[PDB]
């Protein structure tokens, strides 16, 4: 466990590519080639009222990263399913955990790969059991 994440703007990448960043594009969330655009920039805000963090796209305020009934992470004007606990495991590496309820299974952002290829993969909300799983480790780079 660790947090140590200030409020501000970040880019988000996976362990599979230095060149692919989490971007909101054609109404879809995925990892795309590095750009200077506002759609691959993320606003991190810690919220004390109910703990944990909210992520919003800077090209799209008013809506948060949330998970739906299909287990997809997506941009929502919410309900909310939007609160996240980034668990720090290295200098800028995090497991992004769902905050929900005790004694049940932990859930985290999961980015599937086919032999290190993540093209067109969505981020899914799936069970988490350790801090070792490459598909559940994200790098948050401060801007």
């Amino acid at each position: 466990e660790r947090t140590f994440l200030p409020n501000g703007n970040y880019k988000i990448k996976s362990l599979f590519s230095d060149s692919l960043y989490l971007t909101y594009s054609s109404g879809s969330l995925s990892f795309l080639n590095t750009s200077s655009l506002d759609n691959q920039k993320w606003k991190l805000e810690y919220i004390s009222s109910s703990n944990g963090f909210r992520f919003s796209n800077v090209a799209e305020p008013n809506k948060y990263l949330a998970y739906n009934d299909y287990g997809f992470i997506y941009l929502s004007s919410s309900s909310n399913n939007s609160l996240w606990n980034p668990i720090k495991i290295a200098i800028n590496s995090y497991i992004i955990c769902t905050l929900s309820i005790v004694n049940v299974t932990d859930y985290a952002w999961t980015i599937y790969d086919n032999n290190n290829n993540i093209t067109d993969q969505p981020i899914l909300n799936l069970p988490n059991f350790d801090i070792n799983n490459s598909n559940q480790i994200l790098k948050l780079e401060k801007l």
Binding site: L29, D69, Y112, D120, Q121
Partner: protein, 285 residues
């Protein structure tokens, strides 16, 4: 359950239905979109399974002569039909519960995701739950339409040329319709062979490949020999026409000799090419 004719065999064609409603089927409603629809047995509701042995997963191809295949539109949660690009999002594990016969369609590109039908009859992919909205049933189209039925078979070459036992001979030929018992064929599925026989009404004997230089089909006594058994299937991409592959050699099919159409033209077994002379139109008597 009981019959094996609905098993998830390579190259067979199916209705794919939600487990909660036998009156709906997966339906291609446009050049890009699928939806649940009331069952009409139309070609845009028929889906050929093609297995990839390396993946242990299948492509699922609509049978309305468009060759489009069921596709997960990654990174969205929507599904479509689209042209076969041999990409991972176009392959599906079909994993079946033995007793219920219920099947999940689990996407090869991201196997956390399965096909799901919603109350609004749309199709989506989703992480997996205990809901029956992720279970589907598969029903073989041909077995449904033809099993235990008395049928007539036209060659695609000519609307008034039918598969006919010759008068006073065992040899099977093309002939104009005269409403003869020689021209009426009981189609019956054999569980052990997973293939069909066709019984001539005139003499109760079966459509059989007689193996010699002529390669004629004749009516023959009941046998366990593969020469008497036929994989009745649709054309590659088109569910309105049939190809009959002989189980003795499935590279060979029921074939009108040199595409001739005159009364008495020999019907034979020959190497598949799928040309007009190998295409059959089967209808209830």
């Amino acid at each position: 359950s009981q019959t094996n004719a609905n098993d998830l065999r390579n190259n067979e064609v199916f209705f794919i239905s939600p487990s909660n409603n036998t009156n709906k089927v997966l339906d291609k409603i446009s050049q890009s979109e699928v939806k649940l629809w009331n069952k009409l047995s139309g070609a845009n509701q028929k889906w050929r399974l093609i297995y990839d042995t390396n993946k242990q997963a299948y492509t699922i191809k609509v049978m309305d002569n468009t060759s489009l295949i069921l596709t997960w539109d990654a990174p969205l949660s929507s599904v479509s039909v689209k042209t076969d690009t041999n990409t991972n999002n176009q392959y599906w594990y079909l994993l079946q519960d033995y007793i219920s016969r219920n099947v999940i369609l689990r996407n090869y590109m991201n196997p956390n995701l399965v096909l799901q039908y919603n109350t609004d009859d749309t199709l989506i992919v989703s992480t997996q739950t205990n809901s029956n909205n992720q279970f589907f049933k598969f029903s073989n189209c041909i077995y449904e339409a033809l099993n235990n039925r008395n049928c007539k078979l036209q060659t695609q070459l000519n609307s008034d040329r039918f598969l006919s036992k010759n008068l006073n001979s065992q040899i099977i030929v093309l002939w104009q319709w005269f409403d003869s018992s020689r021209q009426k064929w009981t189609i019956e599925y054999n569980e052990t062979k997973s293939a069909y026989t066709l019984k001539c009404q005139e003499n109760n004997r079966y459509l059989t490949w007689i193996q010699n230089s002529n390669n004629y089909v004749e009516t023959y006594q009941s046998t366990d020999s593969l020469i008497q058994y036929w994989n009745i299937n649709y054309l590659d991409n088109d569910a309105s026409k049939y190809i009959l592959y002989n189980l003795q050699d499935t590279n060979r099919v029921l074939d009108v000799y040199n595409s001739q159409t005159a009364n008495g033209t020999h019907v034979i077994v020959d190497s598949y090419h799928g040309n007009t002379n190998q295409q059959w139109i089967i209808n209830l008597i």
